[PDB]
């Protein structure tokens, strides 16, 4: 399988970033969603796991 790996040049860009070399998705028929605010509010002290952790550091693109 073809390694579609994008080489970044400048470090000013974020590590996760939509490159212009990638073709755009251009996404353009209903989903089985639950009722809006009928029940199930989240309890206290639940969160995404790494909320305090940043998404990317300076070493992420180099790694």
């Amino acid at each position: 399988p073809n390694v579609v790996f994008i080489k970044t040049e400048d470090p000013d860009l974020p590590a996760f970033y939509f490159d212009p070399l990638i073709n755009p998705i251009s996404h353009r028929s209903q989903e089985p969603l639950p009722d809006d605010d009928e029940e199930f509010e989240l309890p206290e002290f639940v969160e995404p796991f790494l909320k305090d952790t940043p998404l990317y550091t300076d070493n992420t693109a180099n790694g």
């Binding site: 212009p20 073709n23 755009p24 998705i25 251009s26 996404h27």
Partner: protein, 263 residues
């Protein structure tokens, strides 16, 4: 008096020569238009020349390049005339946005793209107008943004690609998350093709009209929402008591600006 009547007749002859130059404007024959612009008063009739250039840009799309060439020549002659032309273009773009007319806003966007393409107006106001057109979901706004992208894809690539990425994200969200018809999907596909090609067939820089040097020309950041001055007071002639000194200054400004076969 006789002096005011002579000044009014000279202003009418200058306006008639400007209208004859704008009507007979050609891409290969822009030197005759430049000589007709230099024959009349360029400083005293700068507002009349800007009004004639705006009328030629609004009347036909083929004369928009000649109007951009005249605006670039006026900006290279003096930065105040180019700043007044950019402020008038920004006020026309704001009037076309507020009036909710598709054709007037399309003509104002084409004139703004021609003025930014002629290095006479700043691209920050055009980028803000493109961001305002992208933030408002409409078919006419998307068509005006696609026309501005097809007019100045080279300028958008040389200025900022983050605005193009935001426009692509807004078009993707318009196609799925917002309501998109067949014409809206066609406009989104045209915007995607303009962003992918980068307007290589029709670039921002236009040949045969760019006869004004960019070193003597200045760029003015005149916003559309700001109180832009059209500078139309100098378009109509007035009985100046110091009109002889103004005529001498205009004459001085026009003088300064001009064997093996055997082997």
């Amino acid at each position: 008096k006789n002096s005011l009547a002579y000044q009014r007749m000279s202003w009418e002859a200058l306006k008639k020569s400007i209208n004859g130059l704008i009507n007979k404007v050609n891409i290969s024959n822009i030197s005759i238009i430049i000589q007709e612009l230099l024959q009349e008063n360029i400083v005293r009739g700068r507002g009349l020349l800007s009004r004639s250039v705006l009328q030629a840009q609004s009347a036909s799309p083929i004369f928009t390049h000649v109007y951009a060439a005249l605006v670039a020549i006026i900006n290279s002659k003096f930065p105040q005339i180019g700043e007044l032309i950019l402020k008038r273009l920004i006020l026309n773009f704001r009037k076309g946005y507020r009036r909710n007319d598709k054709q007037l806003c399309l003509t104002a966007s084409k004139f703004v793209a021609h003025l930014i393409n002629q290095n006479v107006a700043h691209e920050v106001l055009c980028l803000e107008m493109l961001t305002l057109l992208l933030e408002r979901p409409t078919d006419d706004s998307v068509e005006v943004a696609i026309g501005f992208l097809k007019e100045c894809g080279l300028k958008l690539t040389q200025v900022s690609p983050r605005g193009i990425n935001a426009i692509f994200e807004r078009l993707r969200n318009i196609l799925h998350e917002s309501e998109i018809d067949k014409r809206v999907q066609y406009m989104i596909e045209v915007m995607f093709a303009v962003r992918k090609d980068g307007f290589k067939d029709h670039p921002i820089i236009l040949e045969g009209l760019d006869l004004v040097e960019e070193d003597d020309q200045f760029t003015h950041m005149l916003p559309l929402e700001d109180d832009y001055n059209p500078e139309d007071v100098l378009n109509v002639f007035k009985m100046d008591p110091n009109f002889m000194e103004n005529e001498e200054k205009y004459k001085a400004i026009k003088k300064e600006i001009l064997i093996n076969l055997v082997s």
